[PDB]
């Protein structure tokens, strides 16, 4: 019995440590994704505003004609 418990404790130690590593990798990848989604948000909003004013100006110019 006790030998089986030693095997169990060894396995559990191993699993816990490798779980820790995996979780750290998760966190790193997730924060990277967050940063770069933020940059994409900025660029998309800028494109939205620029292109809206673009269409407005073009239609006004056509009206002038």
């Amino acid at each position: 019995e006790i030998e089986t418990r030693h095997s169990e404790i060894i396995k559990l130690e191993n699993s816990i440590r490798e779980l820790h590593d995996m979780f750290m990798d998760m966190a790193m990848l997730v924060e990277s994704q967050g940063e770069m989604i933020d940059r994409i948000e900025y660029n998309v909003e800028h494109a939205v505003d620029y292109v809206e004013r673009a269409v407005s100006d073009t239609k006004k110019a056509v009206k002038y004609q």
Binding site: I9, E13, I16, L19, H20, A27, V30, V55
Partner: protein, 60 residues
């Protein structure tokens, strides 16, 4: 030896929990953001389609 092993187990488990909670919070923020970006994308798509088609029709 088992006693200190379980001390280690407790410490590791609580640490993983504490960090994961913030992992989840971050993922929730990502999800929250994506819908706004999607709405903006769809709005620009509609505006561009209508504007360009109207201009092309006017060209005739």
């Amino acid at each position: 030896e088992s006693l200190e092993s379980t001390r280690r187990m407790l410490q590791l488990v609580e640490e993983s929990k504490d960090a994961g909670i913030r992992t989840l919070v971050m993922l929730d923020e990502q999800g929250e953001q994506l819908e706004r970006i999607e709405e903006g994308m769809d709005q620009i798509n509609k505006d561009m389609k209508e504007a360009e088609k109207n201009l092309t029709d006017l060209g005739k």
